[PDB]
Design a protein around this ligand. Structure first.
Ligand SMILES: [Mg+2]
Ligand SMILES: [Mg+2]
Ligand SMILES: [Mg+2]
Lengths: 401, 323, 98, 113, 112
C-alpha cells in the first residue's frame, strides 16, 4: 500500500556522489593492474563466475516469430543477432562488477537507425550520484587527459549499470570486494615482502672470516682488505682450498632455518578465504579436506556462491540492458519472458551422462538435449517424446531386437 | 504468484541472509503508479527497530537513517510493513535474536587471537641479525661507534652472498625464529568460531581426522541438513503467511485462504543418489512422484503422469514386440 | 577457462579484423556471412568423449557425433541427420536374427 | 577449562622478547635507563627484518612459547560435555580411533537412535 | 577461406604467441603481383607502437627498426594494418597490456 516506498534508505548525504572517491576507484585499478598473486586470484574468480559463457532463452519464444529483415525471426534469434559476442561481454562486465562496485556502460547506435552494441565504460572513471531514495540520478566521470584530468557529467538515462556486490536491497551503488578486503590484501603483500627479504638475508649461509689471535694483536681495516682479497667469494671457486697460520678462522653464518612455507600457506589461506575462493585456487592444499563429505561441502559452497553471483548479474543484465534494446531498436514485445543464463563452470558431462542412463526413461528428448547441452530434436513430435530418437528411428521397421 | 514474484530466488537469498545476520528481515509492499502490485521491497534491517505491545506483538516500527546532517528519524504503523524472524528465544518472541550479537564475545575472541598471531609472526616468525661489538670485559663501544658498524652490516644493502671479514672482537649473533604452533592456534580459533556459528569445521578450511569418514561424517552432515531444514521451514511458513497471502488478498482475484507453500531447495542433494533410488524403487512411484524427486516438469498428460510405469515404457507400448 | 577466454578473444578479433576484410576485398562471397574461427581445446580426452558417445549417442545425430568425435560428417545428409549409427543403418540394408 | 585455555594461550602460546641490560656483577641500570632501551627494542615499531647492533652488555633473550597440549584438554573437555549431555563425541567436532568403524560404530549410533 | 588461409594453424600459433607476450599481435594484408590475396603477413611487434585518438581508437602506427646505422623510423595510416589484443585493461582499451611488462618485477625476483 505504497507508491513511493515509505521507508528511508540511510543515504550518507553529508559525504558529490557516494563516499567512493575517484582515488578509491583508481586504487582498485592499481590492484588489478599490478599483476602477481592477488590479481591472478581475482581473475580466477571472474573466470569461474563468467568464463563458461552464456545462453539466451525466451519462454514462449516460438510465438514471437515475426518478419524482421523481410524474413522470420523469433526474439531469441533477434537477441542472438543483436548481442553476437555476448560471452565476451558477460566475462568483461562480470569481471568489472566483481572488482569494482559496478560494471557500467552505454547503448550505441549505427550512424542512422539500428543498434550497434552495449558498450562498456572504464568503471574506475565513473561514480554515481544518488537521490534521497538511493536511486542513481546522474553519473559523474573523471578521466586522464592532455593535462591532469577532465571532468564530465551524464544524465543516467542512456547509461546502464550492473551491481553484483551490494550492502542490501535499496543499495544501487554497490561495494568493491577489493576495497572491502583492502586490509587483508595489504597484510598479504606485507608478509610476502617480509619473506622475500628474510630469504635474502637468512635463506643462504654467509662466510665470516675472523682474523688475529683472541686477546692478541689487533687487526685494522687495511689489514682486513688484504684478507678479503684472499677469501673473496666473487673469485673463489667450488674446490678452492685455504692454507693459514693458526690465527685465521673461517667461520660461517648458517642458513637460519624458518618455516616460510607455513607462512606462505597461512597467507594464502587468509587471502583465498577473504576473497571467498577455495584454498586450492592458491596452489595450496589441506589434509582430509581433499576427500569425501569435507570436499563435497566446500565445492558445494563454491557453486552456490557462483550461482548467486550469476543469477544477480543475469537478472540485472536482462532488465536494464536487453529489455531497453528490445524497446528502442526491435519490432518485438519488450515485456516478453527473456532469460539470460550463465553456464556452470564445474559441470561433469560424465555425471550428466550417468544420470541420463539411469533416468532417461522419465525425460523427454528435449529435456535430455537441454541437460546434455545439445540442440533440441528437429521434429517437435520426437522432441516431446520420452523414448530415445534413435529408438524411434529404430522403429522405422526393425525386428528380432 | 510466479508472475507476481518473478525473481523470488534472489529475494529469498536477500531476506534469508538478513534474517540470519539481524534479528529480522523487514520490508514493505509496493504498487505500480495506479492499481497493480509492484514488489515486496526489503528495507535496511540495521535502520529499523520494532515497538512491541504488552503481548509482544509488533505494534509500530521505528526507523533511524543517516542523512545530509547526522541522522533523521521516522515511525511507521506496522500495517504495510512485514517482517520475518528466523532466530527467536521462543514462540511469543516476535522480535527475534541476532546470531551475531548472541556470539559477539566469540567473534571478538577470534579477531583478537588472529591479530595476536599476525603480530607474533612479524616479531618471531623471522630470524633477526644481532651484531655484538667489542671484547667482553674490554673497551666500551658507544652509539657513534655502532653507527659505523651498522653501516657495514646493514640488512638493507646486504645481499645473499655477502661475506664478512673482522677482527676477533666482532660477533654476528642471530635471533632465531622462535618456533610456536600458530597453525594449531588457527585450527583452534576456527573450530571455536565455526562451532559457535553452527557451521561444520570444514567450512573454515580446517579439517579433523576420522570425522571425514563413515558414521562420524554422516552425523555432522545430518546435523547441518537438519539445521538448514529448520531455518528453511521457519522462513518459508512466515514468508507465505505475512507477505504472499496479503498480496493475494490485496492485488489478486484468487482466494487468499488457498493452500500455498513456498519451499526452499536442499543445497546438499546428490542427484546420483536420487537416480539410484529411482532405479531401485521407481516401480512403486507414479511418474509425477518421479518427476518431483528428479526435479523435472510433471508429464504433459495426466493419464501418464498418474501411472506407475515409465512414460518411455508406455510410449514403447504404442506397438512394440519381441522385447 | 583461462585458455577458453584467450581463445575466444583471439578468434572473434581475427575473424572481425583480418578474415572479413579479406572476404570484402579479394572474394566473390558476402563478407557479412556468419564466419567463426574456433581453436581446439589442448586438453581433450578422446576416451572421455568416446565414453560419452557410448552413454548418450542415442540422443545425438550422426553429425553431432562426428563433430564431438572430430571427424568429417557423413557423406549423405539423410544419414548425417539421423540419430541412430550409420553402421546400424548400413546393417539394415538386409540383415536378420540380430 | 575453556576460559583457562584461552588465558593460557594468551600468556604462554606466543614467545615474548626479554631484553636484559648491563653486565652481570657490573654497574646497575635504573628504570629511566631501561626506558631508552625499550624505545630501541619496541615490538610496536619493530619489523620482521630489523637488525640490532650492540655492545657486549646487552642480551636479547626470549621467553619461548612453552608447549602444553591444549588440544588434548579440549578433546577431554568435549568428551566430558558431550557424554554428560548424552550426545556422541562426534557432535562436538572431536573424534576417536577405532570407534569410527565396525561394531564399535554400530553400537554408539544404535544407542543414539 | 581454407584455400585463402592454408597454414592457419601456424599463423594462429605465431600471432597468438605474440599477442600473449606483447600488448598486441600486428601485421598487414598482402597481394600477389596483380589481383589476388597472398597472405595475412605478421610484423615484428617490438618494432611497432600505435597512436590513439581521443576516443582510444588506433588512428596510426609508428615503427622503429634497426638498420645499417642505428635505427630508422616509419609511420603507417592504420588502414591496411590489422592488430589483435588478447590482454587489455578493459573494453575501450585498443592498445592492450604486455603480460611480461605487467609481471616484470616478479620475473626479476625469480632471476635474482
Ligand atoms: Mg699490542
Ligand atoms: Mg677502559
Ligand atoms: Mg658501582
Amino acid at each position: 500500500a505504497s507508491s513511493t516506498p515509505q521507508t528511508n534508505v540511510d543515504s550518507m548525504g553529508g559525504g558529490n556522489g557516494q563516499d567512493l572517491t575517484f582515488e578509491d576507484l583508481r586504487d582498485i585499478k592499481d590492484v588489478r593492474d599490478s599483476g602477481g598473486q592477488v590479481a591472478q586470484l581475482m581473475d580466477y574468480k571472474a573466470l569461474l563466475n563468467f568464463g563458461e559463457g552464456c545462453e539466451i532463452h525466451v519462454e514462449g519464444d516460438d510465438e514471437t516469430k515475426q518478419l524482421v529483415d523481410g524474413e522470420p525471426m523469433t526474439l531469441s534469434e533477434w537477441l542472438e543477432d543483436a548481442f553476437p559476442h555476448l560471452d565476451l561481454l558477460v566475462l568483461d562486465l562480470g569481471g568489472d562488477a566483481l572488482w569494482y562496485p559496478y560494471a557500467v556502460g552505454e547503448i550505441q547506435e549505427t550512424i542512422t537507425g539500428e543498434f550497434k552494441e552495449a558498450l562498456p565504460a572504464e568503471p574506475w572513471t565513473l561514480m554515481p550520484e544518488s537521490d534521497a531514495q538511493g536511486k542513481v540520478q546522474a553519473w559523474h566521470q573523471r578521466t586522464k587527459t592532455h593535462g591532469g584530468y577532465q571532468t564530465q557529467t551524464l544524465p543516467a538515462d542512456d547509461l546502464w549499470h550492473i551491481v553484483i556486490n551490494k550492502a542490501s536491497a535499496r543499495d544501487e551503488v554497490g561495494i568493491s570486494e577489493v576495497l572491502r578486503n583492502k586490509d587483508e590484501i595489504q597484510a598479504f603483500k606485507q608478509n610476502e615482502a617480509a619473506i622475500n627479504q628474510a630469504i635474502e638475508l637468512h635463506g643462504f649461509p654467509q662466510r665470516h672470516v675472523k682474523v688475529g689471535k683472541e686477546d692478541g694483536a689487533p687487526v685494522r681495516d687495511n689489514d682486513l682488505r688484504r684478507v678479503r682479497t684472499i677469501f673473496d667469494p666473487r673469485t673463489t671457486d667450488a674446490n678452492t682450498a685455504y692454507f693459514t697460520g693458526q690465527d685465521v678462522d673461517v667461520e660461517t653464518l648458517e642458513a637460519h632455518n624458518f618455516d616460510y612455507s607455513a607462512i606462505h600457506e597461512m597467507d594464502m589461506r587468509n587471502l583465498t578465504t577473504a576473497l571467498g575462493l577455495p584454498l586450492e585456487a592458491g596452489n595450496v592444499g589441506a589434509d582430509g579436506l581433499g576427500s569425501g563429505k569435507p570436499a563435497e561441502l566446500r565445492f558445494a559452497l563454491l557453486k552456490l556462491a557462483i550461482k548467486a553471483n550469476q543469477r544477480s548479474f543475469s537478472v540485472q543484465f536482462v532488465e536494464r540492458v536487453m529489455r531497453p534494446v528490445v524497446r528502442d531498436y526491435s519490432p518485438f514485445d519488450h515485456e516478453a519472458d527473456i532469460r539470460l543464463e550463465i553456464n556452470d563452470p564445474l559441470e561433469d558431462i560424465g555425471e550428466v551422462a550417468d544420470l541420463i542412463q539411469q533416468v532417461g526413461d522419465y525425460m523427454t528428448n528435449e529435456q535430455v538435449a537441454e541437460k546434455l547441452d545439445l540442440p533440441a530434436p528437429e521434429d517437435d513430435e520426437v522432441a516431446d517424446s520420452y523414448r530415445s530418437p534413435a529408438d524411434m528411428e529404430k522403429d522405422e521397421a526393425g525386428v528380432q531386437d
